[PDB]
Design an enzyme around this catalytic site. Structure first.
Site, mmCIF file in Angstrom:
data_model
loop_
_atom_site.group_PDB
_atom_site.id
_atom_site.type_symbol
_atom_site.label_atom_id
_atom_site.label_comp_id
_atom_site.label_asym_id
_atom_site.label_seq_id
_atom_site.Cartn_x
_atom_site.Cartn_y
_atom_site.Cartn_z
ATOM 1 N N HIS A 133 38.028 49.113 43.009
ATOM 2 C CA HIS A 133 38.389 49.250 41.594
ATOM 3 C C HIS A 133 37.226 48.950 40.661
ATOM 4 O O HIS A 133 37.393 49.061 39.442
ATOM 5 C CB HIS A 133 39.625 48.400 41.213
ATOM 6 C CG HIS A 133 39.448 46.897 41.273
ATOM 7 N ND1 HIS A 133 38.581 46.198 40.456
ATOM 8 C CD2 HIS A 133 40.119 45.958 41.985
ATOM 9 C CE1 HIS A 133 38.693 44.902 40.693
ATOM 10 N NE2 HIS A 133 39.620 44.728 41.617
ATOM 11 N N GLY A 184 36.970 38.683 36.553
ATOM 12 C CA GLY A 184 35.651 38.776 37.132
ATOM 13 C C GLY A 184 35.507 38.154 38.508
ATOM 14 O O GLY A 184 34.447 38.300 39.125
ATOM 15 N N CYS A 221 37.025 39.073 41.225
ATOM 16 C CA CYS A 221 37.200 40.081 42.277
ATOM 17 C C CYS A 221 35.931 40.287 43.084
ATOM 18 O O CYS A 221 34.824 40.274 42.541
ATOM 19 C CB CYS A 221 37.632 41.425 41.685
ATOM 20 S SG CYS A 221 39.046 41.259 40.632
HETATM 21 O O1 LIG Z 1 44.407 41.255 38.391
HETATM 22 C C1 LIG Z 1 43.447 41.884 38.087
HETATM 23 C C2 LIG Z 1 42.036 41.366 38.414
HETATM 24 N N1 LIG Z 1 42.103 39.931 38.620
HETATM 25 N N2 LIG Z 1 41.983 39.330 39.809
HETATM 26 N N3 LIG Z 1 42.115 38.011 39.649
HETATM 27 C C3 LIG Z 1 42.335 37.753 38.317
HETATM 28 C C4 LIG Z 1 42.544 36.559 37.588
HETATM 29 C C5 LIG Z 1 42.753 36.608 36.205
HETATM 30 C C6 LIG Z 1 42.759 37.848 35.542
HETATM 31 C C7 LIG Z 1 42.551 39.028 36.261
HETATM 32 C C8 LIG Z 1 42.336 38.984 37.658
HETATM 33 N N4 LIG Z 1 43.660 43.145 37.396
HETATM 34 C C9 LIG Z 1 45.022 43.568 37.111
HETATM 35 C C10 LIG Z 1 45.483 44.384 38.307
HETATM 36 C C11 LIG Z 1 44.689 45.524 38.928
HETATM 37 C C12 LIG Z 1 45.392 46.072 40.049
HETATM 38 S S1 LIG Z 1 46.777 45.265 40.233
HETATM 39 C C13 LIG Z 1 46.706 44.184 39.026
HETATM 40 C C14 LIG Z 1 42.549 43.985 36.998
HETATM 41 C C15 LIG Z 1 42.202 44.089 35.663
HETATM 42 C C16 LIG Z 1 41.141 44.901 35.304
HETATM 43 C C17 LIG Z 1 40.444 45.600 36.281
HETATM 44 C C18 LIG Z 1 39.268 46.489 35.903
HETATM 45 C C19 LIG Z 1 38.746 47.492 36.669
HETATM 46 N N5 LIG Z 1 37.738 48.001 36.001
HETATM 47 C C20 LIG Z 1 37.612 47.348 34.834
HETATM 48 N N6 LIG Z 1 38.570 46.405 34.787
HETATM 49 C C21 LIG Z 1 40.795 45.495 37.613
HETATM 50 C C22 LIG Z 1 41.852 44.685 37.965
#
Ligand SMILES: O=C(Cn1nnc2ccccc21)N(Cc1ccsc1)c1ccc(-c2c[nH]cn2)cc1
Ligand SMILES: O=C(Cn1nnc2ccccc21)N(Cc1ccsc1)c1ccc(-c2c[nH]cn2)cc1
Lengths: 305, 305
Positions: A41, A143, A145
């Site tokens: 992602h 961030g 991830c």
């Molecule tokens: O959950 C996430 C990413 N993520 N991981 N641990 C976290 C802790 C606090 C906040 C966000 C967090 N998401 C939401 C999501 C995604 C698939 S299922 C649920 C997320 C948000 C933004 C992005 C992104 C990709 N490119 C730019 N932003 C990816 C995942």
């Protein structure tokens, strides 16, 4: 003596964390030999995440759209591919700090250390269990991830977890290092049901053995039980069933303390039926299920790496 | 989100752990520049520990009775000296892996990461607090002496603890890196007494804020209380008195949450008097006091190193 939730030393893994940026998005990657692993992602915008077509999104990317920074060293990307939910970025330089490593897919109830990272830089280390419903209850911010989970055997790092997302319930989900999610989850921003979570019975028993080893003995009772009777009570309290293989794993702890496994099950069934009455066990007022039998033996023997 | 007992990444410290052997006894040392620091009790036999005259014992030794080994490599000791309770072995090789480092003596209530070591090899990492009675509740086996505690500030390692001894109660005591014991303890095997252990009140309040930030809000209420009124209840429950410096430290968490410090003290007052009524807070049924306000902010804003 003493007993703590204890993470593996994180040095060997620190040396593999890199920063991966693609367009607007930045997260962490794992650089082993000449390949950088990271969540796919990274190629998504925030609006993409609502419903991403990952192969169409990756079609639009060339090698130079991937910025990989290792400290201040910029890595040249010379190839890219998607394997399930991780991107593999071939770079022109082998990580000189690559440890001996393996990729493994752990089982629910097993534990691992997480090295939480941001912008490719380590921030902290802590121990986690893969819950029976294949979530983990971690500490991840935006961030984080691409942070990884791992176990160490002497000099070999077994990578078992890469972090991908926080579910709406506030627990965390991710994949093995081949990109296969643990549990039914997908890397799309939708509400997704994790199963009924349950307590990891064999871990609770191991922790009760750790307690006895450390002097906590008030919960030792004069009853015994059978594996079937105990499992009836396990089901009532949302505890994982206890198998013969679990008894066998608890063998070394039962030999050290002189307490047969089914006698410890009788103790636990009593704590389940009568509660703990405000007493503590090893500094906790709840039954603890994130130490495996191997964790206990490690911490009461002194294994090094 | 999520909130976990998180240690600092231990890589910079792993490269400084050596094995020190003085005749019969082996423990861990800390190799920084051209000096290896370790507990002075390494020069004791078992019976020596009952009543050691360390100056007379150090006289009977000269530079070559000390076997320092880094990995497989052995180092050449070329000078020895005793600073309070630590030995300083001068080596003929500066540690090429020496990080930026400070020696620091911390205050009761502050936290640090322990890197637990055996035979000079890192075994695990976990977070501790210097209790108000100057002990810590760690996880230490024979041979763990010489393990160090530390904090990290971007790239600079502030060493604050070196492990020396387990008290007959099973808690642990040690020195700073100048050899001054924390607390009234001495490196002699005689029955020693830690004072009454109180709860770190400013840390519990910090952890309640951590809890609000993560969505556990049930314990909240808009009752008030004066700092003075609160301490009257705190002292009955063996809580450290809450000073104004503590209120100032809790400032930034107060602002993020919109809950004034004294309003939170009112919530703690009600938790001490009426208990938790079987509910939990951040997955724990006891009030946790080993997170400082600085720990909370760092984990809830993703500080990296
Ligand atoms: O959950 C996430 C990413 N993520 N991981 N641990 C976290 C802790 C606090 C906040 C966000 C967090 N998401 C939401 C999501 C995604 C698939 S299922 C649920 C997320 C948000 C933004 C992005 C992104 C990709 N490119 C730019 N932003 C990816 C995942
Ligand atoms: O406490 C220790 C050593 N120690 N430290 N952490 C431990 C955890 C588990 C078991 C032992 C542990 N002592 C007792 C003591 C009393 C004052 S200072 C140290 C200890 C026992 C033996 C020796 C020794 C030195 N040389 C040979 N034996 C040193 C300390």
């Amino acid at each position: 003596s003493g007993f703590r939730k204890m993470a593996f030393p994180s040095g060997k893994v620190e040396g593999c964390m890199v920063q991966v940026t693609c367009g607007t998005t930045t997260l962490n990657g794992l650089w082993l030999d000449d390949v950088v692993y990271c969540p796919r992602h990274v190629i998504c915008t925030s609006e993409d995440m609502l419903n991403p077509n990952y192969e169409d999104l990756l079609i639009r990317k060339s090698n130079h759209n991937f910025l990989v920074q290792a400290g201040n060293v910029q890595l040249r990307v010379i190839g890219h591919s998607m394997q399930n939910c991780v991107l593999k970025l071939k770079v022109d330089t082998a990580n000189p700090k690559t440890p001996k490593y393996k990729f493994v897919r752990i089982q629910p109830g097993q534990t691992f250390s997480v090295l939480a990272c941001y912008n490719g830089s380590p921030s902290g280390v802590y121990q986690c269990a893969m819950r029976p419903n294949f979530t983990i209850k971690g500490s991840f911010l935006n961030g984080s991830c691409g942070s990884v989970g791992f176990n160490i055997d002497y000099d070999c790092v077994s990578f078992c977890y890469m972090h991908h997302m926080e579910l709406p319930t506030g627990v965390h989900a991710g994949t093995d290092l081949e990109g296969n999610f643990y549990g039914p989850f997908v890397d799309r921003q939708t509400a997704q049901a994790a199963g009924t979570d349950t307590t990891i019975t064999v871990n609770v028993l191991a922790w009760l053995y750790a307690a006895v080893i450390n002097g906590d003995r008030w919960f030792l009772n004069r009853f015994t039980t059978t594996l079937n009777d105990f499992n009836l009570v396990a089901m009532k309290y949302n505890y994982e069933p206890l198998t013969q293989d679990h008894v066998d794993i608890l063998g070394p702890l039962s030999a050290q303390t002189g307490i047969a496994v089914l006698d410890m099950c009788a103790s636990l069934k009593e704590l389940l039926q009568n509660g703990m009455n405000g007493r503590t066990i090893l500094g906790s007022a709840l039954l603890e299920d994130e130490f495996t039998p191997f964790d206990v033996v490690r911490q009461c023997s002194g294994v090094t790496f």
